[PDB]
Write a protein that binds this ligand. Structure first.
Ligand code: HEM
Ligand SMILES: OC[C@H]1O[C@@H](O)[C@H](O)[C@@H](O)[C@@H]1O
Ligand SMILES: [K+]
Length: 377
């Protein structure tokens, strides 16, 4: 199947499942990569940095030192920047973070109220909430919302350069733009917030710069598109918000919403040393694309995998990855989604579909182009 085909983009999960039912580890000749849709296989590969990696220099590919980043480094170089970032994260008092995240979500939901017409929740909520959320965490002044979204979208689309090579160049321009933003914050930002703390811990400057850019961009786009998908489920299934509304009830719901609507559809690795993966033998130099969203629909692990079931065992889904590169912001994201759920219950606003959910032609990171709804108090 063509991952950018409109009908695939409309709902890829049947295509994931049919791929998996024929072979959990599938060689895609025209992409020249293994496609891994089984839960056990994605989980195996994600955690094994000895045989599968993110630093293509381990297969003798020249990567300039100027381009190195936390997400493209493996042990031993990965540990230095990784724990630097985690240490800066852990300096942020969570009471403050929750206060900020809750206020941002409430503010944008109130702007939506009193609107008697159709509203786009992507541009009106997911994106602006994501941007204010991540820059509040970083302790830096928010950039212009529309302008930032354009640069960042170019980068998301460049992730599909394997499918459409022309999508690659716009990303290089957008990366350079975010690098300018990161450079400016490193020079000017307050000692409060994440940026200030990471600057103190400092690892080479390029790794730090590109790693801060990764925090900015991953955090913006992961949260933005998580909210889009979650809201899309909620507008069609408002009963999800009618639940008990306890802490533990929202914990289970958040886990299911992240399992089902996590935006990361593909997480790539390179084979550094031969290893059996599923029914196949993967060879050194082979690229593996882990379809972790499909893995998160593996019926062997998640019965009725396309259904929200609030009594499932926690700790299973792979939407934050697993192992050395597992999402640094996983705690922040589950926190942020709780506050959104909480704000929606406190808003009592009624959001009903005002048209179809429209998805953007991005295959690696799933995102809505538009989520038209009507608001009713
Ligand atoms: C405040 C929010 C977030 C921040 C700051 C953030 C940042 C990051 C960073 C810096 C990494 C790289 C870790 C490394 O390579 O060592 C990462 C990895 C990852 N993130 Fe997050 N992210 C956020 C939210 C999310 C959300 C909501 C999702 C999905 C629901 C997500 C999915 C992932 C995944 C799957 C990985 C692993 C990629 C891999 O295996 O290399 N992130 N994130
Ligand atoms: O798969 C697209 C992206 O998922 C992300 O959460 C991480 O930022 C990257 O490691 C990865 O390239
Ligand atoms: K060198």
């Amino acid at each position: 199947y063509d991952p950018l085909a409109p009908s695939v983009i409309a709902d890829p999960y049947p295509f994931y499942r049919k791929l998996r039912e024929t072979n959990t580890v599938h060689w895609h000749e025209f992409l020249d990569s293994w496609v891994v849709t089984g839960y056990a296989e994605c989980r195996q590969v994600l955690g094994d940095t000895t045989n599968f990696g993110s630093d293509f220099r381990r297969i003798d590919v020249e990567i300039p030192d100027t381009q190195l980043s936390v997400q493209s480094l493996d042990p031993p170089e990965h540990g230095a920047i990784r724990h630097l970032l985690v240490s800066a994260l852990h300096e942020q008092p969570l009471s403050t973070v929750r206060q900020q995240f809750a206020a941002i979500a409430a503010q944008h939901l109130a702007e939506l109220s009193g609107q008697p017409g159709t509203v786009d929740l992507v541009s009106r909520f997911a994106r602006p909430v994501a941007l204010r959320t991540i820059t509040a965490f970083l302790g830096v002044p928010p950039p212009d919302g529309a302008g930032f979204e354009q640069w960042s979208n170019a980068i998301v689309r460049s992730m599909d350069a394997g499918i459409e090579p022309a999508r690659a160049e716009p990303g290089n321009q957008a990366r350079a733009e975010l690098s300018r933003l990161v450079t400016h914050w490193l020079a000017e930002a307050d000692e409060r917030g994440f940026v200030g703390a990471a600057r103190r811990a400092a690892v080479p400057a390029a790794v730090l710069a590109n790693s801060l850019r990764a925090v900015l961009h991953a955090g913006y786009e992961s949260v933005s598109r998580l909210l889009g998908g979650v809201l899309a489920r909620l507008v069609r299934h408002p009963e999800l918000l009618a639940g008990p509304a306890t802490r533990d009830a929202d914990e289970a719901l958040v886990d299911e919403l992240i399992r089902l609507d996590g935006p990361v559809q593909a997480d790539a690795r390179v084979c550094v040393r031969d290893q059996p993966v599923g029914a196949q033998l993967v060879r050194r130099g082979d690229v593996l694309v882990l379809f972790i969203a499909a893995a998160n629909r593996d019926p062997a692990v998640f019965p009725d995998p396309d259904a929200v079931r609030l009594t499932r065992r926690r700790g299973l889904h792979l939407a934050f990855g697993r192992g050395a590169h597992a999402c640094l912001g996983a705690g922040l994201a589950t926190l942020q989604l709780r506050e959104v759920l909480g704000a929606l219950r406190a808003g009592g606003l009624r959001l009903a579909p005002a048209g179809p959910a429209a998805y953007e032609p991005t295959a690696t990171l799933r995102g809505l182009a538009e989520l038209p709804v009507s608001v009713r108090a």
